Design a protein around this nucleic acid. Sequence first.
RNA 1: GGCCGCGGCAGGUUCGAGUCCUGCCGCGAUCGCCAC
Length: 443
Amino acid sequence: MKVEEILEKALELVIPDEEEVRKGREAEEELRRRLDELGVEYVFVGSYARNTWLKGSLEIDVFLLFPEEFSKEELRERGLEIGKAVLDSYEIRYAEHPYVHGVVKGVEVDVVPCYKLKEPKNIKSAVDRTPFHHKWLEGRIKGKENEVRLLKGFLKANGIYGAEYKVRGFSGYLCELLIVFYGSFLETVKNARRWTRRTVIDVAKGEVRKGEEFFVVDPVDEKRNVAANLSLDNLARFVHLCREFMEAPSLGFFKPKHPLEIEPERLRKIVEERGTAVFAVKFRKPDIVDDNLYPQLERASRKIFEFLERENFMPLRSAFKASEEFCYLLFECQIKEISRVFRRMGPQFEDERNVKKFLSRNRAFRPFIENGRWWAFEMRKFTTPEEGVRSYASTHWHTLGKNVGESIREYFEIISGEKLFKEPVTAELCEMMGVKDSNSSSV
RNA sequence: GGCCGCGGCAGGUUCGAGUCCUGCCGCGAUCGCCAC
Ligand SMILES: Nc1ccn([C@@H]2O[C@H](COP(=O)(O)OP(=O)(O)OP(=O)(O)O)[C@@H](O)[C@H]2O)c(=O)n1
Ligand SMILES: [Mg+2]
Ligand SMILES: [Mg+2]
């Protein structure tokens, strides 16, 4: 099995065992000890302070509260200083807002400097609302922490948990606001089935209305969309899963699906049977953080895809992969080869000023009249997608994202055929082409 | 870094470009939006 007997067996997958929780309190206790020793004003926020973190994903967030008068430079220089003095080991790789990731007694800790504000109206940093989220949520989320862990685990199992640009899914804070709104995981799933791309969920007003886009209003700042970085597709993937779940509840919805090793021979036969052109652009991964890389991989991939369209290679889907050393942009086209000749439109037969110009241009195959206007046969410069993409990548490297484009300028290569199936892109290829039985939630 | 705007200014392609492609600059009041 029944709807409820499956949620029982699902709590064993999302709730942290007490051996892990204990490891957390010991780290928390030691963190408060060191922070109180430095006489800095701080506050514990996030999934750990609300006890709604997922099993096997323990991470303690700590926000440092600094005076409003501080410069963005003083905030950084002081934030990093405290972070390093509090953490056993640390690491600094941030995107826009400075912070310090590290470890304390074996658990991961984030130390994020922000401004101590009263009323979160005219925020200074992007992270200034986060302490105010905790104030609003702590009183209302009490009792429903496991209903949050169900929604998080559900989303995590189908790869749409995370607001980061690698995922474009549901932030952890968005999940908590949904449970406060619907009361339970089961009630969120039920009502989610009838969401649309114009649904507006105002938690503060206890109201659902229609809008310009999917919009979950922040109780703390009504102008801010909590689900801003949730893509329309991942919105659809969620709504779809909810309809499937209510139709036939299963525990497998909470089981992480990992890919399968697909033999390069079976993969060669799939592409053969499709009769498509499957190739990829390979270049060095720029040394940048993921929230800078993926929006650019998304851009580079799109810019080339749009190129293939207007060049009439009739592309199907695109995809990308980032290994440790290299990045891959994969494409699938219906046209492996097109003619050298195509027909270009000329002027109408009346205005000879324009016609004589059209006919004056030397061509190899002579122009002709059709439906009252002139046409000419022109030649292409490339007749295959690979030849075309080699041209586009070489000349228009600059528009494929700043860092990606700059990497593509220094070096890229077009991999095709079986030489590609040996690359670390099999999973992306199977997802892209809709290959069946290439995933398994098996433990 | 990516994305959305009102704008323009050149260049490329074309018989023909406000309209397709590329480069550059200005301004977004919720110091335009996202990332924690
Ligand atoms: N897209 C995001 C990311 C985070 N935050 C804020 O940052 C806090 C903590 O950051 P994060 O670790 O990313 O969120 P968690 O709630 O801790 O999610 P998780 O369970 O995965 O740790 C959240 O409470 C939230 O208020 C946010 O508002 N919007
Ligand atoms: Mg966290
Ligand atoms: Mg954090």
